[PDB]
Design a binder for this molecule. Structure first.
Ligand code: DJ8
Ligand code: CL
Length: 288
């Protein structure tokens, strides 16, 4: 009830004008304010079902942090659920890498890492786990800041996803302790799963693709569980600080794995006080 209206027909304010891409629960649309020309991202999802999607709305409604996409409004009108979300004009980091046909520089990765850790430290304070970190779910502003989007869905919506034969892709970023899991238990170290995913996200940004990228998807699950933690392919190309950060983050034991707060003290990120590296990257991509 709290964050979803049944009164205003969205079409009065918002026009669906395009597609931005595909998330974990289908299409993400571009929406335009008809009077001002101001932009939003949007879900438009065709009473049982209405209740199930609300869990996802409550996550964005609950977060007041710059590095998590804002909820602008939610409407139920004519059998459709509209979720209006902050538009990130820089787009997804994996799209930037596709557009420029290369990985991020270390300074670019350091800005992304610093901001992702601040977001994750905030999320742990709310006892919210993202559950699906990857470069495709890290969005950019033109000013050069990140926004996390596409929070991992509920048990109910994963059920509806499988019953309608939709994917969310091979889980290359998944922590070893939960790679065989359809749904995860509530545990004291559940939230540590995002720290592993952050480590894999950094490697994906360094090398364009995550580890085990071409393995059979069932073999990926086994490799994540069984393999030594992944390292950068060419360690000589990256600072000792980057490699050390990855080595402490990609701990297969979720108890000993550091928290976001602990990793914010690491020299790889503790002195990152400018987003300029990322501002310039987004400027490069917007040119292409
Ligand atoms: C809310 C909700 C409800 C239900 Cl019931 C189920 C799941 C979810 C969670 N899904 C999202 O938060 N998706 C999302 C929400 C917003 C955006 C992107 C999103 O995903 C990733 C899509 O791929 C990237 C496509 N390029 C861009 C470019 C700019 N921008 N600016 C915002 C988003 C975005 N996407
Ligand atoms: Cl989505």
């Amino acid at each position: 009830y709290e964050h979803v209206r049944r009164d205003l027909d969205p079409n009065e304010v918002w026009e669906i004008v395009g597609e931005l891409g595909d998330g974990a629960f289908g299409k993400v649309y571009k929406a335009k304010n008809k009077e001002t020309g101001a932009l939003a991202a949007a879900k438009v999802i065709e009473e049982e079902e209405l209740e199930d999607y609300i869990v996802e709305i409550e996550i964005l409604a609950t977060c007041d942090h710059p590095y998590i996409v804002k909820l602008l409004g939610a409407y139920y009108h004519d059998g459709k659920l509209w979720i209006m979300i902050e538009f990130c004009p820089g787009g997804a980091v994996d799209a930037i890498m596709l557009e420029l046909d290369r990985g991020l520089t270390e300074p670019q990765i350091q800005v992304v890492c610093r901001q992702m850790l601040e977001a994750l430290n905030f999320l742990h304070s709310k006892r919210i786990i993202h559950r699906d970190l990857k470069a495709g779910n890290v969005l950019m502003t033109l000013e050069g800041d990140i926004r996390l989007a596409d929070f991992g869905v509920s048990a109910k919506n994963l059920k509806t996803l499988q019953k309608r034969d939709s994917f969310i892709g091979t889980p290359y970023w998944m922590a070893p302790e939960v790679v065989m899991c359809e749904t995860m238990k509530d545990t004291p170290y559940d939230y540590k799963a995002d720290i592993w995913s952050l480590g894999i996200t950094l490697i994906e940004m360094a090398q364009i693709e995550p580890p085990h990228h071409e393995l059979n998807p069932m073999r990926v699950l086994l490799k994540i569980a069984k393999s030594d933690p992944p390292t950068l392919l060419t360690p000589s190309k990256w600072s000792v600080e980057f490699r050390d950060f990855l080595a402490i983050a990609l701990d297969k034991n979720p108890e000993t794995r550091p928290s976001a707060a602990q990793l914010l003290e690491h020299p790889f990120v503790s002195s990152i006080t400018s987003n300029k590296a990322l501002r310039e990257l987004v400027a490069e991509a917007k040119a292409e």
